[PDB]
Design a protein around this ligand. Structure first.
Ligand SMILES: CCOc1nc(N)c2nc(-c3cncc(F)c3)n(Cc3ccc(CN4C[C@@H]5C[C@H]4CN5C)cc3)c2n1
Ligand SMILES: CCOc1nc(N)c2nc(-c3cncc(F)c3)n(Cc3ccc(CN4C[C@@H]5C[C@H]4CN5C)cc3)c2n1
Ligand SMILES: *[C@@H]1O[C@H](CO)[C@@H](O[C@@H]2O[C@H](CO)[C@@H](O)[C@H](O)[C@H]2NC(C)=O)[C@H](O)[C@H]1NC(C)=O
Ligand SMILES: *[C@@H]1O[C@H](CO)[C@@H](O[C@@H]2O[C@H](CO)[C@@H](O)[C@H](O)[C@H]2NC(C)=O)[C@H](O)[C@H]1NC(C)=O
Ligand SMILES: *[C@@H]1O[C@H](CO)[C@@H](O)[C@H](O)[C@H]1NC(C)=O
Ligand SMILES: *[C@@H]1O[C@H](CO)[C@@H](O)[C@H](O)[C@H]1NC(C)=O
Ligand SMILES: *[C@@H]1O[C@H](CO)[C@@H](O)[C@H](O)[C@H]1NC(C)=O
Ligand SMILES: *[C@@H]1O[C@H](CO)[C@@H](O)[C@H](O)[C@H]1NC(C)=O
Ligand SMILES: *[C@@H]1O[C@H](CO)[C@@H](O)[C@H](O)[C@H]1NC(C)=O
Ligand SMILES: *[C@@H]1O[C@H](CO)[C@@H](O)[C@H](O)[C@H]1NC(C)=O
Ligand SMILES: *[C@@H]1O[C@H](CO)[C@@H](O)[C@H](O)[C@H]1NC(C)=O
Ligand SMILES: *[C@@H]1O[C@H](CO)[C@@H](O)[C@H](O)[C@H]1NC(C)=O
Ligand SMILES: *[C@@H]1O[C@H](CO)[C@@H](O)[C@H](O)[C@H]1NC(C)=O
Ligand SMILES: *[C@@H]1O[C@H](CO)[C@@H](O)[C@H](O)[C@H]1NC(C)=O
Ligand SMILES: *[C@@H]1O[C@H](CO)[C@@H](O)[C@H](O)[C@H]1NC(C)=O
Lengths: 772, 772
């Protein structure tokens, strides 16, 4: 169907609309730029290869290049692979870029460049050189960047990439860059705010450096600036998960009361981890459009009880005061000043790590009339006592986050403590008001705990110590709850009435409640689903279920059931019939996940026991060694069948005879060593076939008739054991000229033999000697 | 060093003392008995193969045979492989066994035999036919077994192997078996005790059948009988994890009060799961040597409060009353009759599954002066309340097991519910007094909870809900405790004084306490070990540890540290120096397990940081892709290094030059494709080398100097990718003629090629074509 196979080990994409021809050679194990990149090419990406040099030959004919992404061909030793270290830094010849008169972006991050490449074209707007070894910026070396708008110079001198000296910036070095809009000098061992900066700046990033003092003429001319980040200068180093040296005498970063007076257009000010003990109100008189303020990881515990500066922040949308506890203090309560009530625009308020024992309703009084307050995040505070009913006054909020506390009767997992949360590399909220009580110490629950909280749409009890026999009496106020996360508890299904009070329950997660399922003789009423008339999705993963008092689960509403990580192999012990219909009366079940169930075989009758409308069935990761494909005829609405990561050695003789409906067949990571002679014959609804990571040596046209292959949206065959003899002539030819999508022709569709062709990719194979 | 290689795919062993030449071909995928079995063979095992028939040729010359183990060559389909089902039942030709004049044991279990094989020689003493299809026993078919003493006929008719009729035993079928001592007819659909049985019987197994009544004279002549098992006739079927049919009206097994009057010699009486509601004292009038009584899984709850039959059991050693609770009752307390006090020889009392809310001290008073009580087992009782100090009156006991209860302020896992716990296939007690509180609902602890338990040597709190900051005040009475299992809790190491109260603690398990290590910003004092001056072994597996407030763990006593399943990869982030000596001041550490720590490379300084007496180091299952072997010289006492299940591709050029001490090198399950030219040269300390499951094609003699091979206790080479060309001539000759121990030369030391030799064993390879 193609006259000319593409040998090029890169994805080539066309945007005729944006007149962009995108060549992506990310991570293709290249040691030189490939030959034959399309002449018209605009976007060329070579990230994560081992190309040792750039020279005028490199970009060649590619005079239409508007972006070169040549990152991480020589990553700093502590940041890159230690099994494939880069031996000598990237070498950039003179004259390598001067010819590309249209070049608008040059990414050279992570190549151990010692100096800024020069001879760059006047079209250049973005220059990225993060994670190199450039720690002296001289103004003459920036002449070439007259038109530059975004300059990334960070991470050239920090603990993961040390330069052992201070960062040096010549006076006024960036001033004649009259179009510079974003300047990043983060993670650089900078000692002073470089002056004078061009007034064009909208974004200035100076965080995680060694700046101890702000002079007040540092930001005199930054009247266009919108983002200022001074975080991590004089860091608060307690439990730092990276090497951290605070400023001497525990000094804060010193910012004169008026250093921000020119920042008329400042929208976000990040002063995270500056060891601040006060926030002088005078900082903020001339910014009255500030919307985002980060004051986390300082020493502002008492300042939180005062905070006169809040009165000057009426347009503030986000305010972060997390981790300001003073070391070794366990406050009894939270003293929030009334000044918080003047934060009329406030949508996001986060105060993690204040560390106090009791939260009572009055201490949140300053927030009672913040009419757009959407998120109150009080996590990681070791609160032991809280009347949950106090949150009736916050029916308005979208998320009340008490995660990680000690109560008893989405941000990254390393977020507040990560060194550079913005470092570049080479959930039930949608249902409505959410109260997150996850990772707490609630050992018992009763309906009263939730009085005056009827409005809740999603409730998170994940990771508590709830080990009680739910009989439908524990959650009665929560008449609108649609989502209950009950995972990582010890649910005791003694009563088939568990959870039935939640009459609008749509999603129930009782995954990882294996405690009681792991001990013999305990009763488990699995048919409790009969009572949740609205339930749509039930997750009971990793429960170790191997016995059930009830022989059938019943639901008229349930569409998806996650039953992964249990012991259906024991429930379906060969000879025991009693549970072969456990799922039959889930009448609108469309998706069943029973991967990870040790099902080395499926008893006869499992398929007949499946509910009538099943579309998507996962039997992955079961150690399946045999499979009676013919019993798929019982699965009359089956469209996706996932047999990945098993021990299957054969495919059916006639897939067409096993199902008239199957669309997506996933057979990756099995032991298949060859296909049956007429495998796919007349399988006209087959659309997706993953056979990757098997042991296939040959594929003849008998098994892959082209009138079924050619309607495949995708066809995965990488990581097999292909034998590229003259007997393979049709498969090699078909792989070379098909329009069907086959991922990884470059890196993993390969001959294992014979000898001559070993490790050679099938797409590059010349089999002319088979035709003499 | 051998002139004649052993090609036979079976382990051949010699016992010169007992004149046993044992040939073990268990599970060698045999389709016929291998050729060349030694003529002297006495013990031949062919279990789990696919040998389709036995005929006189089978053993033709093996006339010294004393035992043939020919089990599971045709397992019943519901019991056996579905991927390699047996197609046709085993066929035994006439006269196949009559020649083996010394045959004393014949195992033919699991071959779908239709009839008792005939022609057996009169030497035969043991005959096993479990899991066949022989369900009609006729007196004529047993004449041949005149000298028989042990007869296994069970599992020929039950739910995993159905015969669809009742078992038939001809009247007096076994009477003329004048030497029969063991008769087993378990799992057979037997309906009546077969009569008359020979009076030689010492053991009779009739369990899991359909016997509803014992006749008064069924055991009249069994005056030599020692073990009677009538369990599972009229089963109690509640929560049965197998198909279970009770007797009509849930009636008990009916046993006349005088049925045991001849069993003067009975030591073991098993009446498990017989739906008994009373135990008539009259049963035990003439049994005065009973030592073991199993009364579990009945309806004897009320009887436990009465139990006049105990007065007739002064020699009883074990009594099991487990799982006798009445359905739908949650008794408030346990009523044990005062008659328990007449059980003076009692060593083991098990009453699981009585189901009561409170255990108070007065209720165990019938046991206070049982002077040989060693084990009291009260697990799986849903006890909600128990004052632990009551066990001061049981200092004499070895194990107090309150496991799997609901207390708050070694047996099989399926044991009382297993169908046939004796079905045949084809820990801190040693420290002293043990109180097992594992799998309970103890969320908070304090010193008084253990008042008057100063004697305890081991405490199991595994799997409770303890989520508190231990500061060394919680265990203060436990002055003699040597072992604390604290696994599966939520340990909070805020204080480095945790556990210091346990001043004689030798083994501490805090594995699987990952909860608080999973949230950022929490303080974890890993140096709490300085305070335990006798601690020998610390397990902290699977805690997900990735951050630590203390930089060094300190101990003067610790020998073993299990640190598996954590995130040393994060702690030792490349560029972060601070934790590279975390184990350095554990001065007597001899064993470190830091497997499963995501260590894809080891930062420089890890080996230098290791404590000075480290002998045994596991870095298994880390995704290790590179390894600087030379740094092993920092481990001056290294003897065992485990690098198994990683991604290593090369071995060092000279292992001897990397370590002067290394004895055991485990490199299994890596990506090694070849050995260095002088790999093992002068490695005079090497004793054990595992190179199995790699990708090795060739091994030359330079790499395996024979003055090093001859000091190997073992050398594992199976499952590589050996290439049996003429270039392999030395390795094929050496494997065939060496005396070094190599497991699986028969089964998994195999050629992948070239062509002719694929799948062929190296030991069988004839390379004369390489010498013409
Ligand atoms: C024996 C194996 O079955 C099993 N399986 C479990 N999963 C389970 N859980 C608990 C449990 C215990 N205590 C606190 C909890 F939160 C849970 N129990 C004990 C129990 C036994 C019977 C009854 C029946 N009710 C008591 C009665 C009769 C009915 C109403 N009357 C007051 C209630 C509880 C369990 N027993
Ligand atoms: C977030 C910082 O790190 C961290 N790490 C943990 N692991 C942790 N655990 C708890 C905890 C709380 N309450 C119940 C529990 F069972 C555990 N807290 C809160 C806390 C913080 C400080 C102090 C120290 N105070 C100063 C003293 C001694 C004590 C009282 N005196 C005034 C005590 C408790 C924790 N805080
Ligand atoms: C940041 O700058 C400081 C000071 O310029 C560097 O510290 C010097 O490092 C060398 C080599 O370790 C020492 O001999 C000097 O005494 C250090 N000077 C001071 C003042 O400490 C430091 O290495 C730089 N940091 C990084 C990550 O490169
Ligand atoms: C044990 O014996 C009973 C009868 O003694 C067998 O039950 C018969 O099975 C056939 C086929 O399943 C039925 O058509 C009969 O109605 C059954 N008879 C009775 C009285 O139930 C039973 O199959 C045997 N059990 C096993 C495991 O083989
Ligand atoms: C291609 O490069 C241009 C110029 O840097 C950029 O604006 C555009 O978004 C890129 N498009 C793609 C698909 O990479
Ligand atoms: C509930 O909290 C847990 C634990 O923090 C989290 O993993 C999970 O995603 C939350 N549930 C939802 C539905 O977001
Ligand atoms: C269910 O059990 C709870 C205790 O968890 C109890 O308070 C309640 O009365 C019970 N509900 C019913 C309907 O029996
Ligand atoms: C579930 O099945 C059990 C049978 O053991 C029955 O007692 C109970 O009423 C059933 N409950 C529901 C909700 O179907
Ligand atoms: C060999 O067979 C005899 C006869 O049954 C048996 O007593 C002995 O234990 C067997 N020895 C071994 C090592 O299998
Ligand atoms: C438990 O009994 C002991 C006597 O051994 C007594 O000292 C203690 O007060 C009792 N504790 C409780 C909670 O009843
Ligand atoms: C403690 O109990 C648990 C669970 O019952 C068990 O796995 C563990 O082996 C026990 N600990 C010891 C030291 O035997
Ligand atoms: C240790 O903490 C416990 C609470 O777990 C408290 O009762 C006790 O007073 C504390 N003792 C010391 C010495 O800090
Ligand atoms: C553990 O190390 C910490 C370091 O912060 C120290 O404060 C504490 O006293 C140490 N504890 C012990 C028992 O050595
Ligand atoms: C080394 O340690 C492992 C446990 O991690 C143990 O299985 C093995 O026997 C030890 N080897 C020696 C020689 O002590
Ligand atoms: C390794 O070999 C070199 C060269 O013989 C030698 O100088 C060095 O001492 C050796 N190291 C060890 C630890 O044997």
């Amino acid at each position: 169907a193609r006259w000319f196979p593409k040998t090029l080990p890169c994805d080539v994409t066309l945007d005729v609309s944006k007149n962009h021809v995108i060549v992506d050679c990310t991570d293709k194990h290249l040691t030189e730029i490939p030959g034959g990149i399309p002449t018209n090419t605009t976007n060329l990406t070579l990230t994560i290869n081992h190309i040792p040099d750039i020279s005028p030959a490199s970009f060649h004919r590619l005079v239409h290049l508007v972006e070169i992404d040549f990152r991480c061909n020589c990553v700093p030793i502590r940041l890159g692979s230690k099994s494939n270290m880069c031996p000598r830094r990237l070498q950039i010849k003179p004259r390598s870029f001067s010819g590309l008169t249209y070049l608008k972006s040059l990414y050279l991050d992570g190549n151990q460049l010692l100096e800024i490449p020069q001879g760059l074209p006047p079209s250049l707007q973005l220059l990225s050189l993060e994670a190199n070894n450039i720690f002296s910026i001289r103004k003459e070396q920036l002449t070439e960047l007259a038109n530059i708008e975004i300059l990334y110079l960070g991470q050239n001198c920090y603990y993961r990439n040390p330069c052992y000296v201070s960062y040096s910036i010549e006076k006024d070095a960036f001033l004649n860059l009259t179009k510079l809009k974003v300047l990043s000098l983060k993670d650089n061992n900078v000692t002073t705010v470089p002056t004078v900066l061009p007034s064009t700046l909208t974004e200035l990033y100076l965080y995680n450096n060694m700046i101890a003092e702000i002079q007040e003429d540092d930001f005199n001319n930054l009247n266009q600036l919108q983002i200022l980040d001074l975080s991590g200068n004089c860091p608060r180093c307690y439990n730092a998960p990276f090497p951290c040296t605070p400023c001497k005498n525990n000094s804060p970063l010193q910012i004169p009361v008026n250093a921000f007076d020119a920042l008329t257009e400042l929208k976000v000010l990040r002063l995270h981890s500056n060891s601040l003990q006060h926030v002088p109100p005078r900082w903020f008189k001339n910014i009255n459009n500030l919307q985002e303020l980060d004051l986390s990881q300082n020493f502002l515990a008492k300042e939180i009880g005062d905070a006169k500066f809040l009165h000057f922040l009426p347009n503030l949308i986000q305010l972060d005061l997390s981790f300001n506890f003073e070391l070794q203090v366990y406050r009894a309560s939270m003293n929030l000043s009334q000044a918080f009530s003047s934060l009329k625009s406030l949508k996001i308020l986060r105060i993690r790590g204040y560390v106090f024992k009791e939260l009572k309703s009055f201490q949140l009084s300053p927030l009672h009339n913040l009419q757009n307050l959407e998120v109150l995040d009080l996590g990681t505070n070791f609160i032991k006592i809280a009347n949950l009913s106090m949150f009736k006054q916050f029916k308005r909020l979208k998320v009340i986050d008490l995660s990680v506390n000690k109560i008893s009767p989405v941000l990254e997992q390393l977020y507040y403590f990560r060194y550079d949360k913005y470092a570049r590399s080479c959930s039930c909220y949608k249902y409505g008001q959410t109260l997150d009580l996850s990772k707490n110490s609630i050992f018992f629950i009763k309906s009263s705990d939730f009085q005056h909280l009827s409005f809740l749409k999603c409730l998170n009890l994940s990771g508590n110590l709830i080990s009680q026999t739910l009989n439908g009496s524990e959650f009665q106020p929560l008449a609108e709850l649609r989502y209950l996360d009950f995972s990582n508890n010890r649910l005791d299904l003694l009563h088939s009435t568990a959870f039935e009070e939640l009459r609008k329950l749509e999603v129930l997660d009782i995954s990882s409640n294996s405690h009681y399922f792991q001990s013999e003789g305990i009763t488990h009423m699995l048919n409790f689903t009969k009572n949740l008339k609205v339930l749509q999705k039930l997750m009971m993963n990793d429960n170790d279920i191997s016995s059930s008092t009830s022989r059938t689960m019943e639901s008229e509403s349930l569409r998806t059931l996650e039953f992964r990580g249990n012991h259906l192999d024991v429930l379906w012990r060969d000879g025991d019939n009693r549970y072969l219909q456990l799922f039959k009366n889930l009448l609108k079940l469309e998706e069943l996940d029973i991967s990870k169930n040790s099902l080395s075989f499926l008893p006869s009758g499992v398929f007949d026991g499946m509910p009538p409308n099943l579309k998507n069935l996962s039997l992955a990761k079961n150690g399946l060694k045999s499979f009676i494909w013919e019993k798929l005829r019982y699965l009359k609405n089956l469209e996706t069948l996932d047999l990945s990561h098993n021990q299957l050695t054969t495919v059916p003789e006639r897939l067409s005879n096993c199902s008239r409906s199957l669309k997506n067949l996933i057979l990756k990571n099995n032991q298949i060593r060859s296909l049956t002679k007429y495998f796919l014959q007349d399988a006209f609804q087959l659309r997706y076939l993953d056979l990757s990571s098997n042991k296939i040596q040959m594929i003849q046209k008998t098994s892959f008739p082209e009138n079924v292959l050619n309607n495949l949206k995708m066809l995965l065959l990488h990581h097999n054991r292909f034998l590229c003899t003259c007997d393979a002539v049709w498969f090699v030819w078909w792989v070379q000229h098909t329009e069907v999508t086959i991922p990884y022709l470059a890196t993993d569709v390969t001959c294992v033999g014979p000898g001559a062709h070993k490790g050679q990719s099938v797409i590059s194979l010349d089999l002319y000697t088979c035709e003499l």
